[PDB]
Amino acid sequence: AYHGAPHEIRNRYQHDRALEILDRQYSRDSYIYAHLVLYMKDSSLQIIRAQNPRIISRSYNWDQLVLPNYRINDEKYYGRSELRHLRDGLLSDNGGRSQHDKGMNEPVSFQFIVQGDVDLGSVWFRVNKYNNISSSSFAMEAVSERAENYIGPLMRPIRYFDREMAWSYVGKFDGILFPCHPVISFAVQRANRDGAGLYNGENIYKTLIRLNDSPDLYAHYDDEETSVANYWTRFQYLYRTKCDIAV
Amino acid sequence: AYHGAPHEIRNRYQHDRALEILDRQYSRDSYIYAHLVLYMKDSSLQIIRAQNPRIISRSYNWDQLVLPNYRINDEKYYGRSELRHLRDGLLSDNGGRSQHDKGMNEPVSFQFIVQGDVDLGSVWFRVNKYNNISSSSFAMEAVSERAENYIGPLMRPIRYFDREMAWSYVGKFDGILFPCHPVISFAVQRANRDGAGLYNGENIYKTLIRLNDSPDLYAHYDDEETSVANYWTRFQYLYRTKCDIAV
Amino acid sequence: AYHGAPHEIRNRYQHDRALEILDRQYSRDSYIYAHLVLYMKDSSLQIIRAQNPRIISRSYNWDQLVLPNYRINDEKYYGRSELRHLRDGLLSDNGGRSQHDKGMNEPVSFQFIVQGDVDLGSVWFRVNKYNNISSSSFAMEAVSERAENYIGPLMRPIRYFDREMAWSYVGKFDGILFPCHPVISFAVQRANRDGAGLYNGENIYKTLIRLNDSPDLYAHYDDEETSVANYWTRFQYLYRTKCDIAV
Ligand SMILES: Nc1ncnc2c1ncn2[C@@H]1O[C@H](COP(=O)(O)OP(=O)(O)OP(=O)(O)O)[C@@H](O)[C@H]1O
Ligand SMILES: Nc1ncnc2c1ncn2[C@@H]1O[C@H](COP(=O)(O)OP(=O)(O)OP(=O)(O)O)[C@@H](O)[C@H]1O
Ligand SMILES: Nc1ncnc2c1ncn2[C@@H]1O[C@H](COP(=O)(O)OP(=O)(O)OP(=O)(O)O)[C@@H](O)[C@H]1O
């Protein structure tokens, strides 16, 4: 028998670290991420990130999606009255006196991205009209469950070291498939392939105590490349550009 | 035996549809609705609608109830300092330098309406003072459960095709039975008359994933008739006018 | 045997009342309180109070912690563009064009206080950077559970009639132990020393229906003494001053 040298400890640790990071997403103590990216009429982006170690349920009213808004109030396009009149019309057919069909403050389109060990069967995304009645114009007809809004399979995955680790969905607020004047709701939970649910008797505490684990982050970027440079690549958030590059 | 004609298929389907809509409220995939309607000093209305397929728990601070506010910022009555001074006084007895006892921005009265297959025993509504201490002036004395706030039986139902389908409660913010300078909390869940709870081991997932199913809707209407015309009747939200008409 | 006088009924009732109030905190129908106190650059205080009969989970983004903000908008230090540029830099290293390293609107330091029959093992407090990635600069590396953030033992209790009834934690936003440009998350639940959990099959209803029992209260005080005079002592919220007096 012979021994005359060390194993490549440094290299072995590097492999372990690479796997540690690639596989961290499976830990219940890592995060799942949901980004709502709004492409505005000046080509600037408004980014809304939700995150949680376990579960994400979010909704955004029209005035939380337009720019400027009270979270990102860095432009001015309308006086108080003009904005009021506009909203009057977006809520109720012909009920407003606005001279504006659409607002300069309104998004042109969106990209929705979920990242982490997500339960794809839980990925749910619904753009309501301004009036915020689900799948209907009417309160009693309204329905909260529509297969169309379970968008998992319609999404396009983004790969990292050949692993699907994020999923992307995009659309236009041009009224053809999605409302022109949007209200947006979404949800996603982390995958659980085992029997013991994270909302069961013993795990529900942690879920509730961290239900508001992190505030939603709002960000405003000059244009998409700026966000790629200063956000997506920087923070390790997988992202798909207009020209369809996975960054 | 004889057969020589069709049954009235079209008519039978109409009955089925009428029942489908009248009875949709019993489906766990329909909505329950909670409206907080604020009648302002100019007779305009501020409407806040909460909705969820299962459960609604909401609270609103004073600055989310007055108008203007950061959600509906379409008037201006005060400078920054004036508003600060006012609030200073509303929070702490004689702790503010305002020259204003009451704000032009504050509501005169309210109407609270729950609609859907609601669990009336869950209907809870509490107007705290500005200082937001429940049923007390003191933190340790404060109590979260008071029978007075379980308002179900005090409400007046509104009927649709002879069925009680919404319930209304009203009051004045004149300090006599309700605080002049209000903070408002309410809750309501859908009725469950069967054994298997929607927060049990198997149903809790759906409850949590849709906890923020829909954003609260904020709306501002010229006066009550405008809202009747452009909102209540339009959206099939049952409503009771000042003159007590069920619309 | 002899009887010739009454017991001291009035006095006995007083003892019972004193105990009633001292012990109310153990009732599930009392409140637990969480105060985030921000000491600003002008020595004014911004107070954020969260409260709930059972459970508190909260997070605050940078723009909900600075002053002025959309909840307390009673000062003006920057134009829209200046503020945007500042935030650009706080989010992304060298990604902003601001001439300002720090904002006049940003807090110097904080005091976090939990009060009531709190589960000290549930007390969790985390100041993230502006970029809001937990315990990391990177999305996949991010971790939601760090012992450092379970601050219970690091806190200093405040006594009332010799009973520990509130706990205080303080720190500076000077970037040395806590980020200069903070995002803040915390949680705490009421103590449960018995077997039947308040999130179990029978108790989960009440927890959820009162999840948003009370809105967060925002308050702005001239300086610490003003808050002591008009808030802390007034409302029976235990508090520790700069000079370390328990009020
Ligand atoms: N199979 C083996 N058994 C014993 N020594 C071995 C063997 N293979 C290699 N060696 C090496 O041979 C060298 C001399 O070993 P040693 O003189 O103890 O052998 P041995 O006397 O034959 O073995 P043992 O101790 O089993 O009687 C040592 O450096 C040892 O590491
Ligand atoms: N009870 C009945 N039994 C059979 N046919 C009937 C009856 N009532 C009405 N009819 C009609 O009478 C017509 C002639 O029927 P058919 O000549 O097959 O009667 P049948 O020979 O008496 O009956 P079966 O086929 O039972 O021997 C058919 O159009 C049929 O629909
Ligand atoms: N141990 C006692 N038994 C009876 N009376 C008592 C006693 N101690 C004090 N007294 C008082 O003595 C007074 C007279 O009582 P009473 O004349 O009924 O006594 P008694 O006839 O000795 O007792 P009993 O009714 O048991 O035969 C009463 O005011 C009573 O309250």
Author numbering:
A (entry chain A), B (entry chain A), C (entry chain A): 2 to 248
From the reporting publication:
The fold of all the polyhedrins is highly similar – a β-barrel core sitting on a base domain, surrounded by a common array of five helices (H1–H5). The strongest intermolecular interactions define a trimer composed of a cluster of three β-barrels sandwiched by helices top and bottom.
CPV19 possesses a combination of a long V1 and V2c hairpin. In CPV14 and CPV19 the V2n loops move to occupy some of the central space. In CPV1, 14, 15, 17, 18 and 20 solvent molecules can move between these two voids, whereas in CPV4, 5 and 19 they are blocked by tyrosine residues. In fact the three CPVs (CPV1, 19 and 20) most resistant to alkali buffers all display more extensive interactions between the 3-fold symmetry-related subunits of the trimeric building block – strengthened by either pyridine binding (CPV1 and CPV20) or numerous protein–protein hydrogen bonds.
